[PDB]
Protein backbone atom coordinates (compact mmCIF):
# COMPACT_ATOMS: atom_id res chain seq x y z
CA UNK A 1 0.00 0.00 0.00
CA UNK A 2 1.18 3.54 -0.98
CA UNK A 3 2.02 5.91 1.85
CA UNK A 4 3.28 9.46 2.06
CA UNK A 5 4.70 11.95 4.55
CA UNK A 6 4.57 15.68 3.84
CA UNK A 7 5.27 18.92 5.75
CA UNK A 8 3.75 22.20 4.57
CA UNK A 9 4.53 25.88 5.43
CA UNK A 10 2.34 28.89 4.76
CA UNK A 11 3.50 32.50 5.18
CA UNK A 12 1.12 35.52 4.89
CA UNK A 13 2.47 39.08 4.86
CA UNK A 14 0.14 41.76 6.40
CA UNK A 15 -2.54 39.16 7.55
CA UNK A 16 -6.12 40.32 8.37
CA UNK A 17 -9.24 38.77 10.02
CA UNK A 18 -7.27 36.79 12.69
CA UNK A 19 -5.26 34.82 10.03
CA UNK A 20 -1.78 33.79 11.44
CA UNK A 21 1.40 35.10 9.74
CA UNK A 22 2.81 31.53 9.64
CA UNK A 23 1.31 27.98 9.66
CA UNK A 24 3.12 24.65 9.44
CA UNK A 25 1.21 21.34 9.19
CA UNK A 26 2.43 17.74 8.69
CA UNK A 27 0.50 14.78 7.12
CA UNK A 28 0.87 11.01 6.83
CA UNK A 29 -1.34 10.11 3.81
CA UNK A 30 -4.54 12.27 4.12
CA UNK A 31 -4.07 12.50 7.98
CA UNK A 32 -2.85 15.59 9.83
CA UNK A 33 -0.04 14.62 12.28
CA UNK A 34 1.52 17.88 13.54
CA UNK A 35 0.64 21.60 13.77
CA UNK A 36 2.51 24.83 14.39
CA UNK A 37 1.49 28.46 14.00
CA UNK A 38 2.75 31.99 14.81
CA UNK A 39 -0.12 32.43 17.38
CA UNK A 40 0.47 29.25 19.54
CA UNK A 41 4.29 29.28 18.88
CA UNK A 42 4.23 25.52 19.75
CA UNK A 43 4.50 22.38 17.64
CA UNK A 44 1.69 20.03 18.68
CA UNK A 45 0.44 16.55 17.63
CA UNK A 46 -2.68 16.36 15.41
CA UNK A 47 -3.20 12.56 15.80
CA UNK A 48 -3.51 10.62 19.11
CA UNK A 49 -0.99 8.01 17.83
CA UNK A 50 1.60 10.82 17.40
CA UNK A 51 0.99 12.17 20.97
CA UNK A 52 1.23 8.63 22.50
CA UNK A 53 4.46 7.73 20.65
CA UNK A 54 6.59 10.85 20.73
CA UNK A 55 7.90 12.08 24.09
CA UNK A 56 7.65 15.79 25.18
CA UNK A 57 11.35 16.27 24.10
CA UNK A 58 10.33 15.75 20.43
CA UNK A 59 7.71 18.57 20.65
CA UNK A 60 10.14 20.82 22.59
CA UNK A 61 12.96 20.40 19.99
CA UNK A 62 10.66 20.90 16.98
CA UNK A 63 8.99 23.93 18.59
CA UNK A 64 12.45 25.63 18.63
CA UNK A 65 13.13 24.69 14.93
CA UNK A 66 9.66 25.88 13.83
CA UNK A 67 10.08 29.24 15.58
CA UNK A 68 13.38 29.57 13.65
CA UNK A 69 11.75 28.59 10.29
CA UNK A 70 8.87 31.03 11.03
CA UNK A 71 11.44 33.90 11.25
CA UNK A 72 13.22 32.84 8.00
CA UNK A 73 9.88 32.55 6.16
CA UNK A 74 8.93 36.16 7.06
CA UNK A 75 12.29 37.47 5.73
CA UNK A 76 12.14 35.31 2.50
CA UNK A 77 8.63 36.63 1.74
CA UNK A 78 9.85 40.28 2.26
CA UNK A 79 12.78 39.63 -0.16
CA UNK A 80 10.36 38.09 -2.74
CA UNK A 81 7.95 41.03 -2.46
CA UNK A 82 10.93 43.44 -2.91
CA UNK A 83 12.07 41.42 -6.04
CA UNK A 84 8.49 41.57 -7.45
CA UNK A 85 7.81 45.21 -6.36
CA UNK A 86 4.63 43.96 -4.58
CA UNK A 87 2.59 45.79 -1.93
CA UNK A 88 0.08 44.53 0.65
CA UNK A 89 -0.70 40.89 1.50
CA UNK A 90 1.11 38.06 -0.32
CA UNK A 91 1.63 34.34 0.35
CA UNK A 92 4.69 32.10 0.35
CA UNK A 93 4.31 28.32 0.63
CA UNK A 94 6.54 25.28 0.94
CA UNK A 95 5.82 21.55 0.66
CA UNK A 96 8.48 18.94 1.54
CA UNK A 97 7.88 15.19 1.43
CA UNK A 98 8.20 11.62 0.23
CA UNK A 99 6.19 8.60 -0.85
CA UNK A 100 6.84 4.92 -0.34
CA UNK A 101 5.19 3.11 -3.25
CA UNK A 102 3.70 -0.41 -3.67
CA UNK A 103 6.92 -1.88 -5.24
CA UNK A 104 9.21 -0.40 -2.54
CA UNK A 105 10.36 2.31 -4.98
CA UNK A 106 10.38 5.83 -3.41
CA UNK A 107 9.63 9.45 -4.48
CA UNK A 108 10.78 12.74 -2.91
CA UNK A 109 9.78 16.36 -3.55
CA UNK A 110 10.56 19.88 -2.36
CA UNK A 111 8.54 22.80 -3.77
CA UNK A 112 7.78 26.51 -3.17
CA UNK A 113 4.85 28.69 -4.26
CA UNK A 114 4.35 32.45 -4.34
CA UNK A 115 0.68 33.58 -4.29
CA UNK A 116 -0.42 29.90 -4.64
CA UNK A 117 1.52 29.44 -7.92
CA UNK A 118 4.63 27.24 -8.51
CA UNK A 119 7.75 29.21 -7.85
CA UNK A 120 10.72 26.81 -7.34
CA UNK A 121 10.71 23.03 -7.85
CA UNK A 122 13.70 20.98 -6.59
CA UNK A 123 15.13 18.20 -8.76
CA UNK A 124 17.01 15.82 -6.42
CA UNK A 125 18.43 13.80 -9.41
CA UNK A 126 20.28 16.71 -11.06
CA UNK A 127 20.57 18.73 -7.75
CA UNK A 128 19.00 21.79 -9.28
CA UNK A 129 16.05 24.11 -8.84
CA UNK A 130 13.58 24.69 -11.64
CA UNK A 131 12.58 28.40 -11.77
CA UNK A 132 9.28 29.69 -13.27
CA UNK A 133 10.40 33.31 -13.91
CA UNK A 134 13.35 35.77 -13.49
CA UNK A 135 12.75 36.38 -9.73
CA UNK A 136 12.79 32.59 -9.01
CA UNK A 137 15.96 32.37 -11.23
CA UNK A 138 17.78 34.81 -8.83
CA UNK A 139 16.89 32.49 -5.85
CA UNK A 140 17.78 29.36 -7.89
CA UNK A 141 21.29 30.92 -8.61
CA UNK A 142 21.84 31.61 -4.88
CA UNK A 143 20.59 28.16 -3.65
CA UNK A 144 22.56 26.24 -6.33
CA UNK A 145 25.82 27.97 -5.13
CA UNK A 146 25.42 26.00 -1.84
CA UNK A 147 26.24 22.48 -3.06
CA UNK A 148 26.34 20.96 0.47
CA UNK A 149 22.76 22.12 1.19
CA UNK A 150 21.51 20.50 -2.10
CA UNK A 151 23.16 17.18 -1.09
CA UNK A 152 21.66 17.51 2.45
CA UNK A 153 18.17 18.01 0.81
CA UNK A 154 18.62 14.95 -1.48
CA UNK A 155 19.63 12.84 1.54
CA UNK A 156 16.66 14.10 3.60
CA UNK A 157 14.15 13.27 0.80
CA UNK A 158 15.59 9.83 -0.10
CA UNK A 159 16.64 8.57 3.33
CA UNK A 160 15.39 10.59 6.40
CA UNK A 161 11.87 11.27 5.17
CA UNK A 162 11.35 7.56 4.31
CA UNK A 163 12.66 6.55 7.80
CA UNK A 164 10.22 9.06 9.46
CA UNK A 165 7.33 7.84 7.25
CA UNK A 166 7.99 4.15 8.23
CA UNK A 167 8.24 5.18 11.94
CA UNK A 168 4.96 7.17 11.81
CA UNK A 169 3.31 4.33 9.85
CA UNK A 170 4.12 1.83 12.67
CA UNK A 171 2.73 4.33 15.28
CA UNK A 172 -0.48 4.84 13.26
CA UNK A 173 -0.87 1.22 12.02
CA UNK A 174 -4.40 0.76 13.44
CA UNK A 175 -5.64 3.82 11.51
CA UNK A 176 -3.32 3.90 8.45
CA UNK A 177 -3.13 0.18 7.64
CA UNK A 178 -6.83 -0.69 8.26
CA UNK A 179 -9.30 -1.56 5.49
CA UNK A 180 -12.95 -0.51 5.69
CA UNK A 181 -14.66 -2.04 2.62
CA UNK A 182 -17.20 0.08 0.65
CA UNK A 183 -20.98 -0.28 0.71
CA UNK A 184 -21.91 -0.02 -2.97
CA UNK A 185 -25.36 0.58 -4.47
CA UNK A 186 -26.61 1.08 -8.02
CA UNK A 187 -29.48 3.58 -8.51
CA UNK A 188 -31.53 3.75 -11.76
CA UNK A 189 -33.89 6.66 -12.65
CA UNK A 190 -35.60 8.16 -15.71
CA UNK A 191 -34.57 11.84 -15.55
CA UNK A 192 -35.57 14.01 -18.55
CA UNK A 193 -38.18 12.00 -20.62
CA UNK A 194 -36.35 9.11 -22.37
CA UNK A 195 -33.05 9.66 -20.51
CA UNK A 196 -32.27 7.04 -17.80
CA UNK A 197 -29.34 7.70 -15.46
CA UNK A 198 -27.35 5.05 -13.58
CA UNK A 199 -25.50 6.11 -10.44
CA UNK A 200 -23.01 3.75 -8.80
CA UNK A 201 -22.57 4.98 -5.21
CA UNK A 202 -19.96 3.88 -2.67
CA UNK A 203 -19.52 4.92 0.97
CA UNK A 204 -17.99 3.89 4.30
CA UNK A 205 -14.62 3.02 2.80
CA UNK A 206 -11.02 3.43 3.98
CA UNK A 207 -8.41 4.03 2.43
CA UNK A 208 -9.87 6.81 0.19
CA UNK A 209 -8.31 5.17 -2.92
CA UNK A 210 -11.12 3.57 -4.92
CA UNK A 211 -11.60 2.72 -8.62
CA UNK A 212 -15.19 2.95 -9.96
CA UNK A 213 -16.18 2.27 -13.54
CA UNK A 214 -19.17 1.47 -15.80
CA UNK A 215 -19.08 -1.43 -18.31
CA UNK A 216 -21.38 -2.17 -21.32
CA UNK A 217 -21.39 -5.97 -22.03
CA UNK A 218 -18.10 -6.43 -20.06
CA UNK A 219 -16.19 -3.72 -22.03
CA UNK A 220 -15.11 -0.09 -21.32
CA UNK A 221 -17.87 2.51 -21.94
CA UNK A 222 -17.05 4.74 -24.98
CA UNK A 223 -19.71 7.22 -23.65
CA UNK A 224 -19.11 9.93 -21.00
CA UNK A 225 -18.81 8.79 -17.39
CA UNK A 226 -19.56 11.54 -14.82
CA UNK A 227 -17.38 11.16 -11.69
CA UNK A 228 -18.09 12.13 -8.11
CA UNK A 229 -15.13 13.34 -6.00
CA UNK A 230 -13.75 11.08 -3.23
CA UNK A 231 -15.17 13.00 -0.22
CA UNK A 232 -14.56 12.61 3.57
CA UNK A 233 -17.70 11.45 5.39
CA UNK A 234 -16.62 12.99 8.72
CA UNK A 235 -16.11 9.64 10.54
CA UNK A 236 -12.70 8.70 8.99
CA UNK A 237 -14.35 7.03 5.95
CA UNK A 238 -15.00 8.21 2.40
CA UNK A 239 -17.73 8.30 -0.27
CA UNK A 240 -17.73 8.50 -4.10
CA UNK A 241 -19.87 7.81 -7.19
CA UNK A 242 -19.74 7.36 -10.95
CA UNK A 243 -22.70 7.92 -13.30
CA UNK A 244 -23.74 7.21 -16.93
CA UNK A 245 -26.94 7.71 -19.01
CA UNK A 246 -28.23 4.47 -20.64
CA UNK A 247 -26.35 -4.95 -20.16
CA UNK A 248 -24.65 -2.32 -17.87
CA UNK A 249 -22.57 -3.14 -14.80
CA UNK A 250 -20.69 -1.14 -12.18
CA UNK A 251 -17.11 -2.26 -11.28
CA UNK A 252 -15.51 -1.21 -8.00
CA UNK A 253 -11.90 -1.97 -6.95
CA UNK A 254 -10.78 -1.22 -3.38
CA UNK A 255 -7.78 -2.68 -1.45
CA UNK A 256 -7.31 -5.78 -3.63
CA UNK A 257 -11.03 -6.65 -3.76
CA UNK A 258 -13.00 -6.36 -7.05
CA UNK A 259 -16.80 -5.96 -6.98
CA UNK A 260 -19.39 -6.12 -9.82
CA UNK A 261 -22.96 -4.75 -9.60
CA UNK A 262 -24.99 -5.88 -12.64
CA UNK A 263 -28.13 -3.86 -13.58
Amino acid at each position, epitope marked *: RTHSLRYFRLGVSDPIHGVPEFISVGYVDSHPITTYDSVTRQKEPRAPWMAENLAPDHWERYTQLLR*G*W*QQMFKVELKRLQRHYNHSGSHTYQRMIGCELLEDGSTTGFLQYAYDGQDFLIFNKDTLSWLAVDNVAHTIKQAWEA*NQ*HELLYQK*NWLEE*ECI*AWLKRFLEYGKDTLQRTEPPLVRVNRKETFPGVTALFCKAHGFYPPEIYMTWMKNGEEIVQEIDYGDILPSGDGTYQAWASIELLYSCHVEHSGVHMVLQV
Partner: antibody
Amino acid sequence: GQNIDQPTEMTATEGAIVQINCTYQTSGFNGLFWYQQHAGEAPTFLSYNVLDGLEEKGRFSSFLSRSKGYSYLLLKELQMKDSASYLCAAEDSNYQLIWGAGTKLIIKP
Amino acid sequence: GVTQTPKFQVLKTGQSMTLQCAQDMNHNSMYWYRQDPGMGLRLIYYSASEGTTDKGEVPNGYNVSRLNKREFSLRLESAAPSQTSVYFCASSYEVSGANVLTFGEGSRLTVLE
Protein backbone atom coordinates in the same frame (compact mmCIF):
# COMPACT_ATOMS: atom_id res chain seq x y z
CA GLY B 1 21.64 9.41 18.08
CA GLN B 2 23.78 7.62 20.73
CA ASN B 3 27.56 7.79 20.15
CA ILE B 4 30.57 9.02 18.17
CA ASP B 5 34.13 7.63 18.38
CA GLN B 6 37.53 8.79 17.14
CA PRO B 7 41.08 7.91 18.43
CA THR B 8 42.34 9.99 21.41
CA GLU B 9 45.73 10.73 19.84
CA MET B 10 47.65 10.11 16.59
CA THR B 11 51.34 10.52 15.73
CA ALA B 12 52.76 10.67 12.20
CA THR B 13 55.91 12.02 10.51
CA GLU B 14 56.32 15.33 8.66
CA GLY B 15 55.94 14.77 4.86
CA ALA B 16 53.88 11.58 5.33
CA ILE B 17 50.08 10.87 5.29
CA VAL B 18 47.60 10.34 8.22
CA GLN B 19 43.99 9.11 8.29
CA ILE B 20 41.79 10.15 11.28
CA ASN B 21 38.87 7.74 11.63
CA CYS B 22 35.46 8.57 13.02
CA THR B 23 32.62 6.10 13.58
CA TYR B 24 29.13 7.21 14.50
CA GLN B 25 26.00 5.46 15.74
CA THR B 26 22.97 7.73 15.43
CA SER B 27 19.19 7.39 14.92
CA GLY B 28 19.00 9.29 11.64
CA PHE B 29 21.76 11.14 9.80
CA ASN B 30 21.93 14.65 8.31
CA GLY B 31 25.68 15.04 7.84
CA LEU B 32 29.16 14.63 9.28
CA PHE B 33 31.43 17.63 9.91
CA TRP B 34 35.18 17.89 10.64
CA TYR B 35 36.66 20.87 12.53
CA GLN B 36 40.29 21.74 13.25
CA GLN B 37 41.19 23.22 16.65
CA HIS B 38 44.73 24.45 17.36
CA ALA B 39 45.86 24.49 21.01
CA GLY B 40 44.34 27.45 22.83
CA GLU B 41 42.37 28.47 19.71
CA ALA B 42 38.76 28.19 18.47
CA PRO B 43 37.57 25.22 16.29
CA THR B 44 37.40 26.03 12.54
CA PHE B 45 35.38 24.30 9.83
CA LEU B 46 37.24 21.81 7.64
CA SER B 47 34.64 19.66 5.82
CA TYR B 48 31.09 18.30 5.45
CA ASN B 49 29.85 14.98 3.98
CA VAL B 50 26.27 13.68 3.82
CA LEU B 51 26.39 11.23 0.84
CA ASP B 52 28.98 8.50 0.08
CA GLY B 53 32.30 9.59 -1.39
CA LEU B 54 35.51 11.51 -0.89
CA GLU B 55 35.72 15.31 -0.92
CA GLU B 56 39.19 16.84 -1.55
CA LYS B 57 40.24 20.36 -0.35
CA GLY B 58 43.98 20.84 -0.96
CA ARG B 59 46.12 18.47 1.17
CA PHE B 60 42.95 17.49 3.12
CA SER B 61 40.25 14.98 2.11
CA SER B 62 37.02 13.85 3.78
CA PHE B 63 35.45 10.43 3.26
CA LEU B 64 32.01 9.14 4.23
CA SER B 65 30.59 5.59 4.14
CA ARG B 66 26.88 5.59 5.10
CA SER B 67 26.46 1.78 5.27
CA LYS B 68 29.57 1.44 7.48
CA GLY B 69 28.65 4.60 9.55
CA TYR B 70 32.23 5.69 9.12
CA SER B 71 34.15 8.76 8.06
CA TYR B 72 37.83 9.65 7.81
CA LEU B 73 39.80 12.89 7.48
CA LEU B 74 42.92 12.33 5.36
CA LEU B 75 45.90 14.71 5.67
CA LYS B 76 48.61 14.46 2.95
CA GLU B 77 52.17 16.01 2.83
CA LEU B 78 52.08 16.60 6.61
CA GLN B 79 53.46 19.86 7.94
CA MET B 80 54.27 20.94 11.51
CA LYS B 81 51.29 23.43 11.26
CA ASP B 82 48.98 20.37 10.99
CA SER B 83 49.55 19.60 14.75
CA ALA B 84 46.04 20.27 16.23
CA SER B 85 42.96 18.47 17.55
CA TYR B 86 40.53 17.21 14.93
CA LEU B 87 36.88 17.20 15.97
CA CYS B 88 34.31 14.93 14.33
CA ALA B 89 30.59 15.87 14.60
CA ALA B 90 27.51 14.05 13.32
CA GLU B 91 24.08 15.68 12.78
CA ASP B 92 21.28 13.35 13.88
CA SER B 93 17.56 12.98 12.84
CA ASN B 94 16.55 16.01 14.91
CA TYR B 95 19.45 18.07 13.44
CA GLN B 96 21.38 17.87 16.71
CA LEU B 97 25.16 17.64 16.65
CA ILE B 98 26.93 14.82 18.50
CA TRP B 99 30.60 15.70 19.00
CA GLY B 100 33.50 13.31 19.26
CA ALA B 101 36.05 13.80 22.09
CA GLY B 102 38.62 14.89 19.43
CA THR B 103 41.89 13.45 18.16
CA LYS B 104 45.11 15.24 19.01
CA LEU B 105 47.45 14.97 16.00
CA ILE B 106 51.17 15.14 16.77
CA ILE B 107 53.62 15.62 13.87
CA LYS B 108 57.16 14.24 14.33
CA PRO B 109 59.71 16.50 12.55
CA GLY C 1 32.44 36.96 12.53
CA VAL C 2 31.84 35.92 16.24
CA THR C 3 33.07 38.20 19.13
CA GLN C 4 33.16 36.69 22.63
CA THR C 5 34.21 38.39 25.94
CA PRO C 6 36.00 37.96 28.38
CA LYS C 7 38.90 35.75 27.14
CA PHE C 8 39.91 34.98 30.79
CA GLN C 9 38.16 35.19 34.14
CA VAL C 10 38.88 34.16 37.79
CA LEU C 11 35.73 33.89 40.02
CA LYS C 12 35.02 33.10 43.65
CA THR C 13 32.45 30.37 44.47
CA GLY C 14 29.01 32.06 44.59
CA GLN C 15 29.92 35.05 42.34
CA SER C 16 27.65 36.07 39.45
CA MET C 17 29.10 36.25 35.89
CA THR C 18 27.91 37.27 32.37
CA LEU C 19 29.66 36.08 29.17
CA GLN C 20 29.03 38.15 26.03
CA CYS C 21 28.75 37.05 22.45
CA ALA C 22 28.03 39.02 19.26
CA GLN C 23 27.91 37.83 15.65
CA ASP C 24 27.97 40.11 12.58
CA MET C 25 27.26 37.38 10.05
CA ASN C 26 23.45 37.84 9.87
CA HIS C 27 23.03 34.35 11.34
CA ASN C 28 19.79 33.18 13.07
CA SER C 29 21.29 30.37 15.25
CA MET C 30 23.53 30.95 18.27
CA TYR C 31 25.02 28.40 20.72
CA TRP C 32 26.86 28.23 24.06
CA TYR C 33 29.19 25.25 24.49
CA ARG C 34 31.61 24.18 27.24
CA GLN C 35 34.82 22.29 26.41
CA ASP C 36 36.37 19.93 29.00
CA PRO C 37 39.29 17.44 28.76
CA GLY C 38 38.54 13.93 27.43
CA MET C 39 35.08 14.77 26.16
CA GLY C 40 33.26 16.28 23.18
CA LEU C 41 31.70 19.79 23.17
CA ARG C 42 28.58 19.94 25.37
CA LEU C 43 25.81 22.36 24.49
CA ILE C 44 24.59 24.45 27.44
CA TYR C 45 21.85 26.51 25.74
CA TYR C 46 21.05 27.49 22.14
CA SER C 47 18.88 30.07 20.39
CA ALA C 48 17.43 28.83 16.99
CA SER C 49 16.55 32.46 15.95
CA GLU C 50 15.87 35.85 17.54
CA GLY C 51 13.02 35.61 20.07
CA THR C 52 13.68 32.02 21.25
CA THR C 53 16.10 30.00 23.44
CA ASP C 54 16.19 26.44 24.82
CA LYS C 55 18.28 24.16 27.04
CA GLY C 56 21.08 22.08 25.59
CA GLU C 57 22.61 18.99 27.22
CA VAL C 58 24.01 20.73 30.34
CA PRO C 59 21.76 23.78 31.26
CA ASN C 60 22.02 23.50 35.09
CA GLY C 61 23.70 26.49 36.75
CA TYR C 62 23.31 28.60 33.60
CA ASN C 63 20.84 30.99 31.94
CA VAL C 64 20.85 32.76 28.55
CA SER C 65 19.45 35.86 26.85
CA ARG C 66 19.07 36.24 23.09
CA LEU C 67 19.04 40.04 23.35
CA ASN C 68 18.65 40.64 19.59
CA LYS C 69 19.63 38.92 16.26
CA ARG C 70 23.37 39.65 17.02
CA GLU C 71 23.70 38.99 20.79
CA PHE C 72 23.49 35.89 22.96
CA SER C 73 24.67 36.14 26.54
CA LEU C 74 25.48 33.35 29.03
CA ARG C 75 24.90 33.91 32.75
CA LEU C 76 26.50 32.00 35.69
CA GLU C 77 24.26 33.08 38.59
CA SER C 78 26.22 31.39 41.39
CA ALA C 79 29.62 30.23 40.17
CA ALA C 80 30.56 26.73 41.28
CA PRO C 81 34.02 25.02 40.87
CA SER C 82 32.43 22.50 38.35
CA GLN C 83 31.92 25.55 36.04
CA THR C 84 35.73 25.83 35.55
CA SER C 85 35.90 25.23 31.78
CA VAL C 86 36.50 26.77 28.35
CA TYR C 87 33.26 28.30 27.04
CA PHE C 88 32.65 28.75 23.30
CA CYS C 89 30.03 30.77 21.61
CA ALA C 90 29.17 29.75 18.05
CA SER C 91 26.64 30.65 15.38
CA SER C 92 25.28 29.20 12.13
CA TYR C 93 22.85 30.58 9.52
CA GLU C 94 20.16 28.15 10.89
CA VAL C 95 20.04 25.02 13.15
CA SER C 96 19.42 22.32 10.51
CA GLY C 97 21.30 21.47 7.31
CA ALA C 98 24.86 21.72 6.01
CA ASN C 99 25.35 25.03 7.95
CA VAL C 100 28.94 25.59 9.14
CA LEU C 101 29.53 26.87 12.72
CA THR C 102 31.72 29.91 13.38
CA PHE C 103 33.18 29.85 16.86
CA GLY C 104 34.13 32.75 19.16
CA GLU C 105 37.70 32.89 20.58
CA GLY C 106 36.78 31.11 23.84
CA SER C 107 36.35 32.17 27.49
CA ARG C 108 38.60 30.48 30.06
CA LEU C 109 36.83 30.50 33.41
CA THR C 110 38.35 29.44 36.74
CA VAL C 111 36.07 29.10 39.79
CA LEU C 112 37.88 28.96 43.18
CA GLU C 113 36.70 28.58 46.83
